[PDB]
Write a protein that binds this ligand. Structure first.
Ligand code: NVP
Lengths: 401, 543
């Protein structure tokens, strides 16, 4: 049978529109889509269905195979409401991620809700009308899916949980998060073990939580200080003063009284030396009393430092960061800000799941057109977060550098 | 011409309900026209009689002047559910691939040949003033007819498409362009197979005798199956020129700027200043007579292009045609263009050629992906070095697809660079600016390590305006090198961004000074703190 489902009061189905895709991506979606038609997963629809959501194709970890990906961000917000996230997982030692989108194909979708899932495959140069289809079973990427299929999920995970009662399994949309403390060899296998147990009903990258913190701010150490040098330090210090209110700068400012040359080297009094020492000592730890509020939204802001570096901060309330960090590089595409920014977005969303089990609202230092033209060329997750574009201040970065 | 095609289920918006509009009691003069019309119509299948059960009704008319019927369904439209948008984007010449032959079938009264949802069918009721009838096919001008017809059309072609994969069909409006690579006899033959096929499902199309001939005009171009052309347009001449007149000329010349070079409309455009009415007559000036001439010649040269060849690389080259303006062309064989265009001087709050060039590229890449589903290899008037230098010093994320340098002045460069560190032996100015928010009265100025200093009163100003002013002064009154320290993170940003183009008079005056200097180092400090230097100017620009 099929459990009924509805949109929230007053809401109507999405009517977003289809971005154009490259040739390579269209061909692939046709192959993929025909097959699913043969199997009765999807059905061509009429012009009497006015709804629509965008779709595209990605490559995964490394295969030559493509994966269909539908952006239900919108449909999800309009879908009605319906586990209690495991504090453990985060404190674990090694989490591997598995894609279970499949399981949903084995379940019928209440036909009244089906129209809402309509989507369209484009055609090059508009020579052909698009190809329209709507889902007949539970569709990957949708919010309702994981819910409606939990009764079955635990049921199958029932045994393995019992067997290994010290490994944590948390689910998020199409992903399954498994965490243990075993040797990174008998860990990698216990996983596979599941890969097979999981494959008896029918389905088919090592993270490391213990090192995700709120990295400390540092200050420059100098041989000899100059006016420029001091001014700069006062600038940064002043900023930080907002977080740590006990930070002082009366003694450092005193050294600048006058209207001197910018390069003029200045000697540090014993007073300034103290101020520094103290300030340095106040910054050896994150600020006090910062706690996660679940009746608010997670926010993530990112700065570009250059040379392949990017810094970020996840917070709920200004100046009270829950976590901060930096993402760089490891052997890949030598120079493509866009690729890097996408990757960075994925890394951050992941943690926000591991820890809090929800996605953060991004603030991207880039331009809409640039972002929308290319991000898909490098995406890799079954999920997609929310985001907006901005004009990064000057300090902000200088501060985190 | 009734169709054996399954119908599309329809419904009225939720809550809404069928029309029940009265029926005019017009003369029997027109009646007999209707009686007949509707009868053949009836026995043609298109309509059917009814009676007691259909309480819905829409006004029907009979029209004389065509010297030999018009039902109005507006009220039924704002009742019908919404349908899926009909293809709004359409093919562009440069996207097609060459053919041996091309024919265009004319799906005439395609509309009236398609069934109407038996269910929904009732609401299309209308009575002939003293017979009740019902529509059975898609009515002229009814909300869903376009959308529904196009689809039905799509189905009917499905098989045929599968079996003749080397054949290519384009549905548009009431048209079917079909081209191929077969021989002229074979091609003629296939077409006739389509006709019958369509004929098979109740959709009639004229024959090879009553057709339409190549080339075909498509949004400005003339199309042959082997190549395309742009009909040389005409610019009338006369004494009388209304504003309206002049506006139109500008429009035409403007579109041709895309295809033809050296087209200009400035002096011809500076002719609408002040105009009081569209019927007003502006005396054509001289430069506006001279320009109008140069354009006429240039417009006499014919322009020929070619189609797309899937087995060849795509390549775009761009040019700096003056500030904010750019030109581009795309080809596959040197000299043989596919398409070319122009981008009007985007004008912002502050940018530079490197930033601008970046957008042009982006726009072209978006364009390309839609025409060909690919992106060309770029050839640009910029140094690879210039690009690496900007890439690292800029905060926003930025990128350019594979490209290669093409020395071809004017190249696009950076008009000035900021020092990464302060300068030894250069004067040092501390500048400030303050303005009241209730009176908008302000003060700008500076102090230096060389004794000197200046202040300046302002009117109708603001915090960011005066703050920028202080900087201009300093830049203005000094040697070829300088160290400048301001407390406005606002003004820092604008400049840190090495802008070279802007709409603000002041920003430009500054950009100019900046281009001049030999070395410049801009520095920032918190405002209103103790910090020496800053607390001097702080005091002088207050009152
Ligand atoms: C107007 C139009 C729009 C889209 N495609 C075409 C046409 N018309 C043609 O004349 C044509 C010319 C060259 C290549 N394809 C063409 N055809 C395709 C059908 C063979």
């Amino acid at each position: 049978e099929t459990v009924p489902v509805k949109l929230k009061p007053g809401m109507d189905g999405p009517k977003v529109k289809q971005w154009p895709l490259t040739e390579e991506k269209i061909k692939a979606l046709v192959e993929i889509c025909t097959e699913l038609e043969k199997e009765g997963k999807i059905s061509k629809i009429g012009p009497e269905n006015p709804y629509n959501t965008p779709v595209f194709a990605i490559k995964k970890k490394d295969s030559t195979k493509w994966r269909k990906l539908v952006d239900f961000r919108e449909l999800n917000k309009r879908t009605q409401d319906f586990i209690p996230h495991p504090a453990g997982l985060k404190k674990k030692k090694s989490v591997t991620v598995l894609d279970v989108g499949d399981a949903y194909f084995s379940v019928p979708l209440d036909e009244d809700f089906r129209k809402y899932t309509a989507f369209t495959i484009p055609s090059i140069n508009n020579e052909t009308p698009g190809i329209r289809y709507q889902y007949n079973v539970l569709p990957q990427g949708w919010k309702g899916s994981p819910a409606i299929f939990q009764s079955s999920m635990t049921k199958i995970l029932e045994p393995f949980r019992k067997q290994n009662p010290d490994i944590v399994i948390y689910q998020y949309m199409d992903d399954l998060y498994v965490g243990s403390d075993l040797e990174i060899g008998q860990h990698r296998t216990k996983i596979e073990e599941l890969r097979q147990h999981l494959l008896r009903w029918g389905l088919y990258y090592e993270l490391h939580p213990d090192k995700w913190t709120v990295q400390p701010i540092v200050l420059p150490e100098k041989d000899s200080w100059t006016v420029n040098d001091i001014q700069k330090l006062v600038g940064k210090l002043n900023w930080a003063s907002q977080i740590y209110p006990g930070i002082k700068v009366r003694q450092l400012c005193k050294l600048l009284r006058g209207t001197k040359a910018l390069t003029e080297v200045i000697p540090l009094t014993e007073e300034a030396e103290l101020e520094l020492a103290e300030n340095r000592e106040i910054l050896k730890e994150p600020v006090h009393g910062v706690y996660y509020d679940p009746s608010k939204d997670l926010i993530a802001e990112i700065q570009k430092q250059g040379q392949g570096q990017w810094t970020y901060q996840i917070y709920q309330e200004p100046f009270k960061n829950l976590k901060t960090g930096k993402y760089a590089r490891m052997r890949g595409a030598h120079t493509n800000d866009v690729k890097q920014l996408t990757e960075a977005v994925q890394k951050i969303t992941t943690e926000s799941i591991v820890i809090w089990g929800k996605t953060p609202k991004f603030k991207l230092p880039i331009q809409k057109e640039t972002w929308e033209t290319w991000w898909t060329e490098y995406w890799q997750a079954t999920w997609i977060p929310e985001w907006e574009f901005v004009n990064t201040p000057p300090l902000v970065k200088l501060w985190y550098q | 011409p009734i169709s054996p095609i399954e119908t599309v289920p329809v419904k009225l918006k939720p809550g809404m309900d069928g029309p029940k509009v009265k029926q005019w009691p017009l003369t029997e003069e027109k009646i007999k026209a209707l009686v007949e019309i509707c009868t053949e119509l009836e026995k043609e299948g298109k309509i059917s009689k009814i009676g007691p059960e259909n309480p819905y009704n829409t006004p029907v008319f009979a029209i004389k002047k065509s010297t030999k019927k018009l039902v109005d369904f507006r009220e039924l439209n704002k009742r019908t559910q919404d349908f899926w948008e009909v293809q709004l984007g359409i093919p562009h010449p440069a996207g097609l691939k060459k053919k041996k032959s091309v024919t265009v079938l004319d799906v005439g009264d395609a509309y009236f040949s398609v069934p109407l949802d038996e269910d929904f069918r009732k609401y299309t009721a209308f009575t002939i003033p003293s017979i009740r009838y019902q529509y059975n096919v898609l009515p002229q001008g009814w909300k869903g007819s376009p959308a529904i017809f196009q689809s039905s059309m799509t189905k009917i072609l499905e098989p045929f498409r599968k079996q003749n994969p080397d054949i290519v069909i384009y549905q548009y409006m009431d048209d079917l362009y079909v081209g191929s690579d077969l021989e002229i006899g074979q091609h003629r033959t296939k077409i006739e197979e389509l006709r019958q096929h369509l004929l098979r499902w109740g959709l009639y199309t004229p024959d090879k005798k009553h057709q339409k001939e190549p080339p075909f005009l498509w949004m400005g171009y003339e199309l042959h199956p082997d190549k395309w052309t742009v009909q040389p347009i005409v610019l009338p001449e006369k004494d009388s020129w209304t504003v309206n007149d002049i506006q139109k000329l500008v429009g035409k010349l403007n579109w041709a700027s895309q295809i033809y070079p050296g087209i200009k409309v400035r002096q011809l455009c500076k002719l609408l200043r002040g105009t009081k009415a569209l019927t007003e007559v502006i005396p054509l000036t001289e430069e506006a007579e001279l320009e109008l001439a140069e354009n006429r010649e240039i417009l006499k040269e014919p322009v020929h292009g070619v189609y797309y060849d899937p087995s060849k690389d795509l390549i775009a080259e761009i040019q700096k045609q003056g500030q904010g303006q750019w030109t581009y062309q795309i080809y596959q064989e040197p000299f043989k263009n596919l398409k070319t265009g122009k981008y009007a001087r985007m004008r912002g709050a502050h940018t530079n050629d490197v930033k601008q060039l970046t957008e042009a590229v982006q726009k072209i890449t978006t364009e390309s992906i839609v025409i060909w589903g690919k992106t060309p290899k770029f050839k640009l008037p910029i140094q690879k070095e210039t690009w690496e230098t900007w890439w690292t010093e800029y905060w926003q994320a930025t990128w350019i697809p594979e490209w290669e340098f093409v020395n071809t002045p004017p190249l696009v460069k950076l008009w000035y660079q900021l020092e990464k560190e302060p300068i030894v032996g250069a004067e040092t100015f501390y500048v400030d600016g303050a303005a009241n928010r209730e009176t908008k009265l302000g003060k700008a100025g500076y102090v230096t390590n060389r004794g000197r200093q200046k202040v300046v009163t302002l009117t109708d100003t603001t915090n960011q305006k005066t703050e920028l002013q202080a900087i201009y002064l300093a830049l203005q009154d000094s040697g070829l090198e300088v160290n400048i320290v301001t407390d406005s993170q606002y003004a820092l940003g604008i400049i840190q961004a090495q802008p070279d183009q802007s709409e603000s008079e002041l920003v430009n005056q500054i950009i100019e000074q900046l281009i001049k200097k030999e070395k410049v180092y801009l520095a920032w400090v918190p405002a209103h703190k103790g910090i020496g230097g800053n607390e001097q100017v702080d005091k002088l620009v207050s009152a």
